[PDB]
């Protein structure tokens, strides 16, 4: 039937269509998403981070520390 209304059938089902592919969509956008929240993340780990550099900090203030114990 070449002659059949090729328009959209406006009276269609506009609902949610429960049978849609619920999988992961492996072809997506794997990039940086530049419009992402550029803020401080208040819920970050406020603890001590035990696995931190326990070394000597070779670049530290080698000066005289003028505010030191001036007593015996």
């Amino acid at each position: 039937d070449p002659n059949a209304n090729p328009n959209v059938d406006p009276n269609a089902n506009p609902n949610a269509n429960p049978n849609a592919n619920p999988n992961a969509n492996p072809n997506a956008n794997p990039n940086a998403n530049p419009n992402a929240n550029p803020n401080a993340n208040p819920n970050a780990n406020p603890n001590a981070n035990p696995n931190a550099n326990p070394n000597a900090n070779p670049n530290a203030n080698p000066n005289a520390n003028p505010n030191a114990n001036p007593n015996a």
């Epitope: 002659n3 059949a4 209304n5 090729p6 328009n7 959209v8």
Partner: nanobody
Framework: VQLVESGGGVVQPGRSLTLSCAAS????????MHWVRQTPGKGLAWVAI????????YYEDSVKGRFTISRDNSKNTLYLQMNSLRVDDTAVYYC????????????????WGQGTLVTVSS
């Protein structure tokens, strides 16, 4: 409401030429489209029809197997690619829009483009 064709020119017989057709001023994704040729000395002649999705296509018996019609709803464009052009295809190609109808039988062609001249000669 504007429908503009493009991509015309002059090619040798046996070559392949593709055409374009841009729609503006109305939602293009909601209309099926036709391509109609106009050969000087003859009346309008239907070529191909696209079913609003590319899901169904139908061609004239004279161009079956050599003509491809496809649409890009994201850019509001039509594509009628012509393969193995012959001298008898020398005509002006118009885009036609099927008007909305409240039935299951379709309706006439509402909007027509200005058309582009495609000629084949040696």
């Amino acid at each position: 409401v504007q429908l503009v064709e493009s991509g015309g020119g002059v090619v040798q017989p046996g070559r392949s030429l593709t055409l374009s057709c841009a729609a503006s001023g109305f939602t293009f994704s909601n209309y099926g489209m036709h391509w109609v040729r106009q050969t000087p000395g003859k009346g309008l002649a239907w070529v191909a029809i696209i079913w609003y999705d590319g899901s169904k296509t139908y061609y004239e018996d004279s161009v079956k197997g050599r003509f491809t019609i496809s649409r890009d709803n994201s850019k509001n464009t039509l594509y009628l690619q012509m393969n193995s052009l012959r001298v008898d295809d020398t005509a002006v190609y118009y885009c036609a829009r099927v008007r909305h109808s409240s039935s299951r039988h379709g309706s006439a062609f509402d909007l027509w483009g200005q058309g582009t001249l495609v000629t084949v000669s040696s």
